[PDB]
């Protein structure tokens, strides 16, 4: 949950993030696959 607002602009979060004074793009959650593996074809977004 990297904020696109001032101050708290980062954090691999675990709940709802409260940046009041943050826009719609003023936050940005990235739903990352930290649970199971995928057969790493480069047509899938691999380990960058």
């Amino acid at each position: 949950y990297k904020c696109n607002c001032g101050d708290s602009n980062e954090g691999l979060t675990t709940t709802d993030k409260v940046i009041n004074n943050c826009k719609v793009d003023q936050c940005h959650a990235a739903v990352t696959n930290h649970k199971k593996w995928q057969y790493n074809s480069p047509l899938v977004p691999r380990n960058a």
Epitope: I19, N20, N21, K23
Partner: antibody, heavy 117, light 110 residues
């Protein structure tokens, strides 16, 4: 708190255009979540959109874009909900709604706009 | 459109718990649905007595509560007075704005 310094009486003609400004305090214009809003003559708050702080500028409603034009004087700590080029039946108040304090947590001061030259 | 069969009617005495028990034309808005019973004041003064659907809003009297009441918008404004003439608007928060309804402008006993 996030409170818009409201517009003046935008007395334009039918087709005349004037801004209902919302000098957004609580943040900057790039820090104050202005919801554009037309406090309509009949019903009340007809939304010109919501815009959270880090942008600030209210992204428009369903019918809330068009004649009411959302813009942001972000370095001037405000937006402009411009009652622009409207017909005669759009005399309404230009207001903001402070998108922090989970609804519009403050209100813009409003401005009475009327189409008559 | 976020205008249900709202709390449009409130005529009470000073200190009365002003209940905008608005029967929602769609249903109960949530805390993420942001069913806030704000005070849209006279002279177009948008303010929150209860905002975000489970929290009392800032800048209002302390007895305000904006939530779900009935099956719709529920304003429990504790301490509603005669000088408290304003609009109990129990409305929603769409997650991209807060949408105040028609509301009920009221004056009280006092």
């Amino acid at each position: 708190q996030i409170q818009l310094v409201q517009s003046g009486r935008e007395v334009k003609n039918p087709g005349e255009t004037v801004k209902i400004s919302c000098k957004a305090s609580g943040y900057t214009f790039t820090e104050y979540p202005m919801l554009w809003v037309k406090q309509a003559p009949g019903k009340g708050f007809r939304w010109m959109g919501l815009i959270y702080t880090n942008t600030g500028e209210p992204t428009y409603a369903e019918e809330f874009k068009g004649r009411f034009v959302f813009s942001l004087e972000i370095s001037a700590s405000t937006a402009y909900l411009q009652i622009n080029n409207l017909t005669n039946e759009d005399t309404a108040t230009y207001f903001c709604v402070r998108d922090y304090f989970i609804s519009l947590d403050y209100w813009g001061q409003g401005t009475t706009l009327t189409v008559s030259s | 459109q976020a205008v249900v069969t709202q709390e449009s009617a409130l005529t009470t005495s000073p200190g009365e718990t002003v209940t905008l028990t608005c029967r929602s034309n769609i249903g109960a808005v949530t805390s993420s649905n942001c069913a806030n019973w704000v005070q849209e004041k006279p002279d177009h003064f948008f303010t929150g007595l209860i905002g975000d659907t489970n929290n009392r809003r800032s800048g209002v009297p302390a007895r305000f509560s904006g939530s779900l009441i009935g099956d719709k918008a529920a304003l429990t404004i504790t301490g509603a007075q005669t000088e408290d003439e304003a609009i109990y608007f129990c409305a929603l928060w769409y997650n991209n704005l807060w949408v105040f309804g028609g509301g009920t402008k009221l004056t009280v006993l006092g």
